C-alpha cells in the first residue's frame, strides 16, 4: 500500500539516527538507579525509547508531536460526524504525518478487508463459561488468533531477517487492529445483550462500525471514536504497553503481545479505575447526596469526610502527570456539549472545582489533579453502556493503536531483548552498609 | 497448613528489612543508565528485587542462596527413585528452607488435592483449532482458569488490604502449580498422542504424575523432576519472569500474569532455544558428517566453517552469564549416567570440548560457553519427546515454580506498580548535543 511504502520511508530516515546513538553516543549516561527505584517498581528510572507519544509531566500527552486539541483539530472528520476516523490516528502514529482524506480512505478500505472474526474464536469464546470476566474474553480471543501470526510463521520458515521483520509485524498488526473492535463487540452482545449479534457493516469506519456491532445509535459513534484515539497511547512505560514491548522484544508476535498486554491492562491498578470511579459516584449521590445532585456545598466538605479520615478519592492522581489529565478535558468538552444536564456528569463537574483545592490544602499526593478514569465511565453510563466490567475491553481497543504502532518500530529499529539485572535485598542491605 | 504459617512467620521477619531500606537508604545510588542501555532492553540495568533466586555472571544460578549440586543433594529424594521432589523445591524457593521428608508430604497431598483441571479447561482447547502452537494452548488454558481467582475474588469483593493480600495470591499459587502439569500433559496428548488420556494416579508426585499422565516410562519421572527444578527460576529480569512480575504489579491475579508470562517465553529468543539447537545438531550429523557421529576433528573444523561464514551457534551465550551454566552440567550429567552411547548425546558431548576453544579465538560474544538449552532436547528426544514445540511448555510448567513463588512475595512485601519513564530519540539527540 502507500502507508506501507511511506512507512519503510520513515524507517530508512530513522535508523541511521539510532545507529549513531549507538556506536558514537552509547555511554552517555541519562538517569541513574536509587534503592527507592528497583524497590518500588523503576518508577521515574528512563530506560525506555518510544516515538509514538511522550508524556510530559505538566503538559500531559503528546502524540507524534502533536496535542491532542491539535490532533483532533487537524484529523479528517467522518462525513455527518464531529470526531475523526480512528484510521487517521493509526496512520498518524505509524508515519509521524497527519493523512489527507485520500490517505484516511486507504487505511479504512484496508481495515474492512481484515475485520472479520475467524470463527474458532467465537467457538472459544463459547467454550469458556459465560460468567468470565470480559477483559479474560478479549485476551484468549486475541491469543487464540496467534495461530495466524505472519510474523510467526516468517520466523518459523527460516526467513527472519533483521531488516524486513517490521514488515510481517506490519501486516499482523493492521490484522489484529482491524478485528479488535469486532471481538470487543462480540463480548459485549455474548454476554450483555442476550447473544443477539449485528454484523458488521462495510459502508462504516471503525468507531461507526463499533457503534453498529454493540447496537448503540449515534452520537455513541462519536464518543467511540474519541475514546479510542484518547486510549490510544500514554508513552510506553505504562504497564499494558511495556508487557507488549517486554514481550515481543522476545520476538513474540503481537497476537503474544497483545494478549499479555491485556492481561496487564486487567489489572485493578491499571485498567479498573475508570468503574471505581462511577460506581464511587452512584454510591454519594444515593447515599450522603440523597438521590440527588448536590449543591456546592455538601459536597465540598463531603470530599473533607473521605479525605481526613483516611482514604483516596478515585480518577484524581497519577505516577507521572502532575497537572490536569488533558484527555479529562477533552471529555469534559465532548460532555459539556453533548449532556450538560445529566446528573452523574453534573457531579463530576463539580468535583473538578472543588477537589483541586482540597488536595491542595494537603500537600500530600504528588498529583493534585484529575486523570481520564475521572470522566470516562459517565458518558458510557449516560449512552447505556452500564456493564462496567467492559470498560476496560474499551481500553484495550483504543490502547491497541498506540501499542501496535509501537511495536512495528520496535522491529523497524532491531530493539533487542529487555533483560535488565535482578539483586536481592541481601545485595542492597550490603550496598546500604548494614 | 504448616507452609501458609511458615511462610506467614518468614513474610514477618522480612517486611521489616524492605521498610527498613526504604525508609533509610532510599536515596543510595546502585546504577546508571547510559543510552546504550535504554534502546538495549535495559540491558545490565540493577532496577528488579528478587530473594527467590540470583544469578551470579560466573558461579551461575543460586535458589535461595543453594547451588544447583547443593539442591540436588539436601532436597528429600523420591522413593524408588533418583531425583527430588519438585514439591520439596517449590516449598524452598517459598520459604528459603530445605524441608524435611513430612514436610514435602504434606506439600505433595497438598497438590493432589487440587490437580484436577476444569472440564470448561478442555472444552476451551478443543474449541481451539488442533493445529495451534501447544504454548498458545498452555497460555489460553491458564488465562481461562482466571474465573477461578481467589486473588480477583479478594479485590473485587472490596476486602483488599496491603498485609493480607500475599495469602489468596498464595492459594492461587498453590492451585495453579498443581494444575499446570495436568495442563501440559492433556495438550501433549491431545496434539500428538491420538488424543487419549491418562488419569492422574494419586499415588504419584508431581514428576511421576507427569509422566504417567505423558505415557513415558521410567527413568522419564526423573528426566521431568530435574527439568522442572533447573528450569525453577533464573532470577526476575528474564522475559517471562519480569512480564509476570510487571503484569501482577498492577494487581493482575496470577492467572493473567502467569498466561502473559507464557506469551514472552513462547518467544524464539527465549523459549524456542531448546529445539532450534537439537534441530541444528540432527541437521548437521545428517549433512556434514553422513548420518553418523563424526570424530573430534571433523565436528571442530565444521565449527569454523558456521562461525567465519557468519552464524551463531544455538545454545551457546547468554545476556547475563559469562560461564559454564551448571544447569547445563546437571542435565550432562544425568546423561554421563543414562545415555552415554546415544549419537545425539555423543554430538552435544563433544561441542562441550571443541566449540568453547574456539568461540575464545574470536573474543567476540561476552559468553563463550553453554546454557541450558544446548542439553535439554537431546535428553527429551531420547525418551521419545521428539515434538519439539511442546519442549517450551515443559519450560512453561518449570519456571512457574520460580515465578509463582515470587509473584507471592511481591504481594506480601507490598511491591509498587512497575511504571519506568520513556524517552523518544529526539530527547536522547538533545542529550547527545545534537
Ligand atoms: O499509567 C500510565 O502511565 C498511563 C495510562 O495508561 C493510564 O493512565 O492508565
Ligand atoms: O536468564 C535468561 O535471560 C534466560 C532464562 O530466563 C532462563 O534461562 O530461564
Same mark, same amino acid.
Given at each position: 500500500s502507500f502507508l506501507k511504502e511511506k512507512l519503510a520511508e520513515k524507517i530508512a530516515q530513522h535508523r541511521p539516527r539510532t545507529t549513531r546513538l549507538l556506536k558514537e553516543?552509547?555511554?552517555?549516561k541519562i538517569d541513574e538507579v536509587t534503592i527507592s527505584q528497583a524497590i518500588g517498581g523503576?518508577?521515574?528510572? +528512563? /530506560?525506555l525509547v518510544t516515538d509514538i507519544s511522550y508524556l510530559d509531566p505538566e503538559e500531559g500527552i503528546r502524540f507524534r508531536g502533536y496535542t491532542i486539541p491539535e490532533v483532533l483539530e487537524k484529523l479528517p472528520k467522518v462525513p455527518g460526524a464531529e470526531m475523526p476516523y480512528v484510521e487517521g490516528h493509526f496512520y498518524l502514529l505509524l508515519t509521524g504525518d497527519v493523512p489527507t482524506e485520500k490517505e484516511v480512505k486507504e487505511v479504512a478500505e484496508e481495515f474492512k478487508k481484515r475485520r472479520a472474526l475467524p470463527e474458532y474464536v467465537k467457538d472459544t469464546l463459547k467454550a469458556m463459561? @459465560? $460468567?468470565? *470476566?470480559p477483559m479474560t474474553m478479549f485476551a484468549a480471543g486475541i491469543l487464540a488468533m496467534? @495461530?495466524?501470526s505472519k510474523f510467526a510463521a516468517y520466523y518459523n520458515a527460516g526467513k527472519f531477517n533483521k531488516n524486513t521483520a517490521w514488515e510481517p509485524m506490519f501486516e499482523d498488526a493492521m490484522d489484529l487492529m482491524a478485528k479488535l473492535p469486532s471481538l470487543g463487540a462480540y463480548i459485549y452482545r455474548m454476554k450483555y445483550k442476550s447473544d443477539t449479534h449485528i454484523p458488521s457493516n462495510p459502508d462504516l469506519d471503525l468507531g461507526g462500525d463499533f457503534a453498529n456491532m454493540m447496537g448503540i445509535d449515534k452520537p455513541y459513534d462519536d464518543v467511540a471514536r474519541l475514546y479510542f484515539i484518547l486510549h490510544? !497511547? *500514554?508513552? /510506553?512505560?505504562?504497564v499494558s504497553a511495556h508487557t507488549a514491548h517486554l514481550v515481543a522484544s522476545? &520476538? /513474540?508476535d503481537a497476537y503474544y503481545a497483545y494478549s499479555a498486554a491485556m492481561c496487564g491492562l486487567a489489572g485493578p491498578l491499571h485498567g479498573l479505575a475508570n468503574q471505581e470511579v462511577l460506581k464511587w459516584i452512584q454510591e454519594t449521590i444515593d447515599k450522603k447526596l440523597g438521590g440527588k445532585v448536590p449543591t456546592k456545598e455538601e459536597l465540598k466538605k463531603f470530599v473533607e469526610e473521605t479525605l481526613s479520615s483516611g482514604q483516596v478519592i478515585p480518577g484524581y492522581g497519577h505516577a507521572? &502527570?502532575? +497537572?490536569? !489529565?488533558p484527555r479529562y478535558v477533552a471529555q469534559r468538552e465532548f460532555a459539556l456539549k453533548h449532556?450538560? !444536564? !445529566?446528573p452523574i456528569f453534573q457531579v463530576v463537574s463539580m468535583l473538578y472545582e472543588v477537589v483541586p483545592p482540597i488536595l491542595s490544602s494537603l500537600? +500530600?499526593? +504528588? $498529583?493534585p489533579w484529575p486523570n481520564v478514569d475521572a470522566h470516562s465511565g459517565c458518558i458510557q453510563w449516560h449512552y447505556g453502556?452500564?456493564?462496567? $466490567?467492559?470498560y476496560t475491553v474499551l481500553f484495550g481497543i483504543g490502547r491497541a493503536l498506540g501499542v501496535l504502532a509501537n511495536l512495528v518500530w520496535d522491529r523497524a529499529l532491531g530493539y533487542a531483548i529487555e533483560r535488565p539485572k535482578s539483586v536481592t535485598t541481601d545485595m542492597l542491605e550490603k550496598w546500604a552498609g548494614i
Open positions: 553516543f552509547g555511554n552517555v523503576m518508577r521515574g528510572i +528512563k /530506560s463459561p @459465560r $460468567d468470565t *470476566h496467534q @495461530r495466524e490510544s !497511547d *500514554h508513552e /510506553s512505560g505504562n522476545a &520476538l /513474540s507521572v &502527570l502532575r +497537572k490536569t !489529565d449532556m450538560p !444536564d !445529566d500537600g +500530600k499526593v +504528588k $498529583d453502556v452500564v456493564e462496567y $466490567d467492559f
